[PDB]
Design a binder for this molecule. Structure first.
Ligand SMILES: *C(=O)N1C[C@H](NOS(=O)(=O)O)CC[C@H]1C(N)=O
Length: 358
C-alpha cells in the first residue's frame, strides 16, 4: 500500500479500536480501483484466533445493498417493475391497505410505516401473511421514509418470484457468482465455520439468530476481500460483463426519494459529493437514521450520479459494518468489526480516510 494510505488508515483506525474496545477489525481501502487490506485483533478472543483477510463478519443491514442490486437485476431482466403492485407478486395479500403499495415503496421504506423488525413470533410464510395482512399504515404510501427490515425484506422476497428461484439461490446465481464473491454467504457452510468470527456483545460471544426475511434484510456474512470486490463492482459497473447485473448495480444507485440532503437508492443511500461530514456523521445516529422522515419523490428517478457519497451501515448483536464509496474518485472503504459500536464513529472514521485520499 502507498504510504499515504497506510498513514491515514493507521492514524484513524488505531484510536477508533482503542476508543470503542473493538476486539477484531478488517478494513479495505479501494484506491484508484485497487484494494488495500488491514487487519487487527481477534476473530475469537478466548481461542486467540486473529482476524485475517478470510475472516467472515456479519454484515447486518449492509446486506440490503445485495438485495437492492438483486432487485435491480430483476428489473433489468424485465421480470419486475418498481411500479408493480405488491399484490401482483403476493395475491394472497388481500387486505385493503395494500392497494397502492408498490414494489418501489417496499424497496425504499416508504410503504407507510412498516416496522423496523419483522416480529420474532413470525416464522412461517403463514405467519408472515398474517403479519402483513394485519399491519395498519400510519401514513399514505410514498410520504414518509421509516427504515424497516420488514419493508425491504418483503421487496427482496417478492422480487425473485418471477425467476422461480429462492432468494438465496437467486442471490448466489445472479450476484455472488458473477462477481466471484466465493466467500460471501447467506448460510455459512459447515466447512467455513472456522473462518466465521464471533461477535462480541457485552463481552459475550454471539452470532445473529435466524429470523423471517433475515437473508433479505440483514443476514449476509462476508470477508474483507469479497467486500472490497463488492465495492469495486458498485464503483465501476461498466466492467461487469453480465449486462443485467451491470444495469442492476446502476439502478440501485438511482435516486428514488429525497429527504433532507440524502437520497434513497435500492439498499444504498447517497448524498452529493462533496458532503458535509456532520450531516452524514450525525445522520447515521439511530436517533435520525431510524426516525420517520418526510420524503419528496424524484420522478423519474435520477440516474446514478458519479459525484456521490454512496454508503450503508449495518449491525447485528455482535458486529458493526460500514461501506462507503465515491464513484467519481474511484475510491471506497469497507470497515468490518466484531463489535456493534456506534454508527457516527464509523462514518467519521471513513470520511476522515476517504477525504484524505481524494
Ligand atoms: C441492520 O443492520 N439493522 C436494521 C437497522 N439498520 O440501521 S443501521 O444501518 O442504522 O444500523 C437497525 C440495526 C440492524 C438490526 N438490529 O436489525
Amino acid at each position: 500500500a502507498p504510504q499515504q494510505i497506510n498513514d491515514i488508515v493507521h492514524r484513524t483506525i488505531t484510536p477508533l479500536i482503542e476508543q470503542q474496545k473493538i476486539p477484531g477489525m478488517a478494513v479495505a481501502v479501494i484506491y484508484q480501483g485497487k484494494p488495500y487490506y488491514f487487519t487487527w485483533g481477534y476473530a475469537d478472543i478466548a481461542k486467540k484466533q486473529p482476524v485475517t483477510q478470510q475472516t467472515l463478519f456479519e454484515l447486518g443491514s449492509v446486506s440490503k445493498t445485495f438485495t437492492g442490486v438483486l432487485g435491480g437485476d430483476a428489473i433489468a431482466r424485465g421480470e419486475i417493475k418498481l411500479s408493480d403492485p405488491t399484490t401482483k407478486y403476493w395475491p394472497e395479500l388481500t387486505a385493503k391497505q395494500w392497494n397502492g403499495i408498490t414494489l418501489l415503496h417496499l424497496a425504499t421504506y416508504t410503504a407507510g410505516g412498516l416496522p423496523l423488525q419483522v416480529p420474532d413470533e413470525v416464522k412461517s410464510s403463514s405467519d408472515l401473511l398474517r403479519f402483513y395482512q394485519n399491519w395498519q399504515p400510519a401514513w399514505a404510501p410514498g410520504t414518509q421514509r421509516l427504515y424497516a427490515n420488514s419493508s425491504i425484506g418483503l421487496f427482496g422476497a417478492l422480487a425473485v418470484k418471477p425467476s422461480g428461484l429462492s432468494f438465496e439461490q437467486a442471490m448466489k446465481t445472479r450476484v455472488f457468482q458473477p462477481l466471484k464473491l466465493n466467500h460471501t454467504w447467506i448460510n455459512v457452510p459447515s466447512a467455513e465455520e472456522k473462518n466465521y468470527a464471533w461477535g462480541y456483545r457485552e463481552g459475550k460471544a454471539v452470532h445473529v439468530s435466524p429470523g423471517a426475511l433475515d437473508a433479505e434484510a440483514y443476514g449476509v456474512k462476508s470477508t474483507i476481500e469479497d467486500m472490497a470486490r463488492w465495492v469495486q463492482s458498485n464503483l465501476k459497473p461498466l466492467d461487469i460483463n453480465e449486462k443485467t447485473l451491470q444495469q442492476g448495480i446502476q439502478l440501485a444507485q438511482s435516486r428514488y426519494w429525497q429527504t433532507g440532503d440524502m437520497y434513497q437508492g435500492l439498499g444504498w443511500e447517497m448524498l452529493d459529493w462533496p458532503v458535509n461530514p456532520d450531516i452524514i456523521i450525525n445522520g447515521s445516529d439511530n436517533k435520525i437514521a431510524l426516525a420517520a422522515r418526510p420524503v419528496k419523490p424524484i420522478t423519474p428517478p435520477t440516474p446514478a450520479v458519479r459525484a456521490s457519497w454512496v454508503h450503508k451501515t449495518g449491525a447485528t448483536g455482535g458486529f458493526g459494518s460500514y461501506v462507503a464509496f465515491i464513484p467519481e474518485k474511484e475510491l471506497g472503504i469497507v470497515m468490518l468489526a466484531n463489535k456493534n459500536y456506534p454508527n457516527p464513529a464509523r462514518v467519521a472514521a471513513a470520511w476522515q480516510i476517504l477525504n484524505a485520499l481524494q
